[PDB]
């Protein structure tokens, strides 16, 4: 649950992102990948990346970038009424690709990452304050989601 004011500052952040989705998507998913090897696993159209240079280099993975930014940005636009945009992509992460939510956090962790990596300085604690709780809203509710799938 946000504020007004909170939400306000997480679409303000969106915009940074909004400037160059397809860079941020990329750095997203190559911190992901590199931080978290086993979550390339998941991915059989990466799994043949070795080194973080081709994933660099890689445009079929800043394209896969920008369809997860486009997704969620959609969904933070809605200010947590996004239970219609939010149902599709729960059911498909837990019964086709099998995510476990582990996964989603660290996902998120990645986002604050990059933010401050592109961002040095221009990234506020007031702003990362109110980003981390919308991505904790989004987990929350894939997880309620999971828990009715009995997916672990
Ligand atoms: C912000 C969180 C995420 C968003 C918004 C997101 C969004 C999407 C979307 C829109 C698709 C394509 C449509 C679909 O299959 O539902 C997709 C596919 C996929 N996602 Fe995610 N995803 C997220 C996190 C993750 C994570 C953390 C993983 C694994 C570690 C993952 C694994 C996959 C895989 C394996 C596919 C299929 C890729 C393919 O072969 O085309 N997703 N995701």
Redesign the pocket.
């Known amino acids: 649950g946000l504020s007004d004011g909170e939400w306000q500052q997480v679409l303000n952040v969106w915009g940074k992102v909004e400037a160059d989705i397809a860079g941020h998507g990329q750095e997203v998913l190559i911190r992901?990948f590199t931080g978290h090897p086993e979550?390339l696993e998941?991915?059989?159209?990466f799994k043949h990346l070795k080194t973080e240079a081709e994933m660099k280099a890689s445009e079929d993975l800043k394209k896969?970038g920008t369809?997860?930014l486009t997704?969620?940005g959609g969904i933070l636009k809605k200010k947590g009424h996004h239970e219609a945009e939010l149902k599709?992509?729960a059911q498909?992460?837990a019964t086709?690709?099998k995510?476990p939510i582990k996964?989603?956090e660290?996902?998120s962790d990645a986002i604050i990452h990059v933010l401050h990596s592109k961002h040095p300085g221009d990234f506020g604690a007031d702003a990362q304050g109110a980003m981390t709780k919308a991505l904790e809203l989004f987990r929350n509710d894939i997880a309620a989601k999971y828990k009715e799938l009995g997916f672990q």
């Not at 998941?42 to 159209?45: A, E, G, P, Q, T």
């Open positions: 992901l979550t998941k991915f059989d159209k896969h369809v997860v997704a969620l599709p992509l498909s992460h086709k690709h995510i996964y989603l660290f996902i």
